[PDB]
Amino acid sequence: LPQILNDEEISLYSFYDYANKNFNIEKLKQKDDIFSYQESEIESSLLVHSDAEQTEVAVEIFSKVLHYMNSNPLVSKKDPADFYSPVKFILTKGLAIESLRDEIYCQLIKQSTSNPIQDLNIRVWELIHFTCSTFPPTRKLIKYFAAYLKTTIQQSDVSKSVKDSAQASYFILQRFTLNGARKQVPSVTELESIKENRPIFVRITATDGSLKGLHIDSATTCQESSNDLSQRSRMRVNSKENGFTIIESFNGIERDIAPTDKLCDVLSKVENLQATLSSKIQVNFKFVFKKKLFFDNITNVPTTSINVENEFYYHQLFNDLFNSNYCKDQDYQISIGSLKLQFESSDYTDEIRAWLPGNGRGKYFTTDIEKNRFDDFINKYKSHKGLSPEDAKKQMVQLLEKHPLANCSLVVCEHQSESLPYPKNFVLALNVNGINIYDPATSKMLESVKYSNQSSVSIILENKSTLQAFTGDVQKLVSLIKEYSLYLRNNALEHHHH
Numbered sequence: 001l002p003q004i005l006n007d008e009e010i011s012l013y014s015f016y017d018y019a020n021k022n023f024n025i026e027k028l029k030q031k032d033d034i035f036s037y038q039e040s041e042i043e044s045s046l047l048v049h050s051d052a053e054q055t056e057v058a059v060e061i062f063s064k065v066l067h068y069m070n071s072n073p074l075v076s077k078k079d080p081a082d083f084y085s086p087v088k089f090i091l092t093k094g095l096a097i098e099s100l101r102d103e104i105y106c107q108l109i110k111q112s113t114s115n116p117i118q119d120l121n122i123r124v125w126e127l128i129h130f131t132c133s134t135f136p137p138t139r140k141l142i143k144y145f146a147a148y149l150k151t152t153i154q155q156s157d158v159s160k161s162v163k164d165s166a167q168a169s170y171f172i173l174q175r176f177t178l179n180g181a182r183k184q185v186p187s188v189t190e191l192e193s194i195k196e197n198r199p200i201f202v203r204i205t206a207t208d209g210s211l212k213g214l215h216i217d218s219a220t221t222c223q224e225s226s227n228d229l230s231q232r233s234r235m236r237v238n239s240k241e242n243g244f245t246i247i248e249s250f251n252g253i254e255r256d257i258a259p260t261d262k263l264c265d266v267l268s269k270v271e272n273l274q275a276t277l278s279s280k281i282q283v284n285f286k287f288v289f290k291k292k293l294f295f296d297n298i299t300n301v302p303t304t305s306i307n308v309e310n311e312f313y314y315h316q317l318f319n320d321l322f323n324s325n326y327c328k329d330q331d332y333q334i335s336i337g338s339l340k341l342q343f344e345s346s347d348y349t350d351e352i353r354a355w356l357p358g359n360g361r362g363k364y365f366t367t368d369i370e371k372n373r374f375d376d377f378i379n380k381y382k383s384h385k386g387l388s389p390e391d392a393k394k395q396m397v398q399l400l401e402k403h404p405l406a407n408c409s410l411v412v413c414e415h416q417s418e419s420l421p422y423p424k425n426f427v428l429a430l431n432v433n434g435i436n437i438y439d440p441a442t443s444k445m446l447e448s449v450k451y452s453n454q455s456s457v458s459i460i461l462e463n464k465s466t467l468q469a470f471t472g473d474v475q476k477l478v479s480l481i482k483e484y485s486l487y488l489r490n491n492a493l494e495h496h497h498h
């Protein structure tokens with residue numbers, strides 16, 4: 001909700017004043033009024049650039065503005081990549097080069113000034129809206145541009161389509177001011193939504209496998225979406241308290257999304273990755289809503305909300321304990337999996353036994369279990385005869401909670417030390433007590449490293465030596481160390497009483 005410009009300031013930011021002062025007037029010869037719509041290509045840039053190459057790129061940008069302005073609107077469905085090709089050229093240049101951003105905006109203000117055709121003016125406003133959704137003008141133009149938007153919205157004799165685009169452009173500029181910069185050029189899907197002044201649809205998978213459909217905009221961060229999912233799911237409304245976040249998943253490989261990262265930036269990365277493929281492998285992308293942080297901040301305990309969060313965590317933990325990077329203990333896996341089968345299908349029958357091969361894989365037992373321990377699984381399952389769904393679930397929850405990896409943030413790591421007393425393949429299990437070094441081959445905790453000793457990721461051990469931990473997701477490890485350290489700092493502040 002922060003205003004870029006107050007209504008009282010509109011009259012103090014006339015574009016004509018900005019243009020008279022900053023336009024490259026000496027290098028712009030031409031018969032046509034340089035300040036307003038023209039059909040022909042500009043001979044030089046509208047603004048002054050120090051690099052002659054950027055002046056050239058600015059002239060090229062104007063041709064693409066014309067190309068988009070003049071394109072058949074109904075080509076957008078036929079070949080969307082071709083329709084958005086001039087848009088992506090413009091947005092790529094502007095996002096990469098900050099000194100070229102004001103030039104882009106001025107070209108769009110110019111082409112929407114005294115435009116004689118409403119259909120062409122509608123296209124320029126689509127372009128303004130795509131630009132606003134990508135990068136803002138610099139501080140030297142942003143208030144003149146915000147005045148131009150407000151004048152268009154409140155005064156200008158323009159179409160409803162232009163007023164809607166101008167309103168949505170002002171809103172997204174405000175949204176970005178609050179949420180910070182983006183890193184990627186919008187995908188075709190995002191551009192399609194922006195063009196029509198509508199939200200972006202994203203599908204989030206919960207830990208229980210269920211799907212939640214969500215509407216976001218270009219500026220939507222992981223934190224905002226995590227708070228929205230939390231609130232909708234009837235959990236504690238603040239993801240900073242409940243510890244959940246949205247992660248990115250590609251072919252089962254999970255990557256952390258930072259709290260200020262834009263979900264639409266993950267979509268552009270996906271769009272590129274799914275195209276660069278050109279049919280060689282599967283391209284299974286998912287957003288997943290999972291518990292990342294484990295704070296012992298359960299006070300007025302809203303038990304209802306807490307129970308919803310724990311139910312999601314039990315699915316996540318059970319699935320992590322069926323993953324060989326974390327757990328290789330078959331007797332433990334048989335114990336939790338047989339109770340889950342008892343909870344879902346009740347007492348053993350020979351029909352359940354015939355159904356289990358293939359079907360139960362990754363659900364009630366692992367690959368190693370169906371392989372070498374099917375009768376041991378069945379024998380354990382038969383021992384649960386007479387347990388109600390409630391009692392089998394109670395027993396499964398106790399077994400999950402008793403595991404050393406329960407209520408820990410899990411990180412798969414490797415080390416190259418020829419002297420350190422840890423297996424080369426280890427797990428960092430981060431919780432409120434420390435950075436725990438865990439051996440998934442033996443199911444044993446090896447060491448609890450203090451957050452206080454902390455300044456690939458270099459971890460300072462008790463003996464003051466350094467463990468250089470290599471991982472596929474450094475951002476996750478770094479953020480976990482920072483979040484638990486901040487939580488411990490906040491608890492020390494609350495404990496101090498003058």
Ligand SMILES: N[C@@H](CCC(=O)O)C(=O)O
Binds near residue numbers: 017018021
């Ligand atoms: N602050 C803007 C515009 C100043 C004006 O319009 O006087 C610039 O110098 O880039």
